[PDB]
Amino acid sequence: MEELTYRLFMVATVGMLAGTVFLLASSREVKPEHRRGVYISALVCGIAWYHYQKMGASWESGSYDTGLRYVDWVLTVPLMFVEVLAVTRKGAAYNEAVRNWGIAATVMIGAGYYGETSAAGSNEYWTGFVIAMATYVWLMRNLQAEGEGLKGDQAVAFENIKNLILVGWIIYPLGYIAPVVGDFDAIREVLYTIADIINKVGLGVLVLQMARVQSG
C-alpha cells in the first residue's frame, strides 16, 4: 500500500486546494455577517493543502511518520470547532466556547501525539489515548448540546454539521487503536487521508450551506 498511500497524498493536496478555492469563491454568495465561518473553512482546507504537500515531499524523501499529521491537526481541529461556533454563537457565549473547545481540542491532539510517539501498546500509548478520548467525548457531547436551541432550517443545517463531525471523526480514534489488534499500520494512513478530505472539505461545504440558510 506504499504507492497507494503516496498517491492519496497527492489526491488530498488537489482535494484540499479544490475545497479552498471553492469556499473562497462561494463566500460572496452569503451576507457579510455570515461569511466568517466560510473564510475559516477555506483557511482550514488551505492549511491542510499546505501540509499534504509537506507530507508528500516527506514521503518521497523516505522520512515520513504518522506524527507529521499532528502539526496539521493541532491548528485545524481547533479551527474546525471555531467555524461551527462561528455559525451557532455570538458575543460572550462565542468567546467562552471558542476558548474552551479550542483548549480541549489542543489537549486532545497533544495527548494523541504523546501516545503516537511511543511504542504501540505502551503505557504512554494508553495514557495518550485515554486523555484524548476523554476530551473527544467531552467535545462531541458539547457539540450535541449545541443544536438544542436552533429551530427550522437552521436546525436541519446544523444537524448536518453535527453529524459529519460525530460520524466522520470516529475514524481518528479507531485508526489510533487498530495497530494493537493487528497489522493495521498501512491502512491507517490510507484511511486518515481519505477522512481528512471528507471531513475538512465536507465541513466547509456544510458551514457554507448553513451560511446560505442564515442569509436566506
Ligand X SMILES: *C/C=C(C)/C=C/C=C(C)/C=C/C1=C(C)CCCC1(C)C
Ligand Y SMILES: CCCCCCCC/C=C/CCCCCCCC(=O)OC[C@H](O)CO
Ligand Z SMILES: CCCCCCCCCCCCCCCCCCCC
Residues 40-69 that bind ligand Y (CB under 6 A): 50, 53-54, 57
Report if residue 122 touches ligand Y, rule: CB under 6 A: no
- Cβ of residue 196: shortest distance to ligand X, in angstroms? 5
* Binds 109: which of ligand Z, ligand X, ligand Y, none (CB < 5-8 Å by kind): ligand X
Binding mask of the shown chain, residues 150 to 169, with x at each position contacting ligand Z by CB under 6 A: -----------------x--
Count CB atoms within 10 A of the CB of residue 141: 10
* Binds 137: which of ligand Z, ligand Y, ligand X, none (CB < 5-8 Å by kind): ligand Z
Residues 16-45 that bind ligand X (CB under 6 A): none
Cβ–Cβ under 8 Å, residues 41 and 164:
no
Report if residue 158 touches ligand X, rule: CB under 6 A: no
* Binds 176: which of ligand Y, ligand Z, ligand X, none (CB < 5-8 Å by kind): ligand X
CA 191/CA 200 separation, integer angstroms = 14
- Cβ of residue 87: shortest distance to ligand Z, in angstroms? 23
**Which residue has the closest beta carbon to ligand X?**
112
Residues 75-104 that bind ligand X (CB under 6 A): 76-77, 80
Our CA angle for 169, 172, 177, nearest 5°, is 140
> CB-wise, 25 or 166, nearer to ligand X?
166
Residue selected from 118, 154, 160, 214 as contacting ligand Y according to rule CB under 6 A: 160
For ligand X, the binding residues (CB under 6 A) are 73, 76-77, 80, 108-109, 112, 129, 132-133, 136, 169, 172-173, 176, 196, 199-200
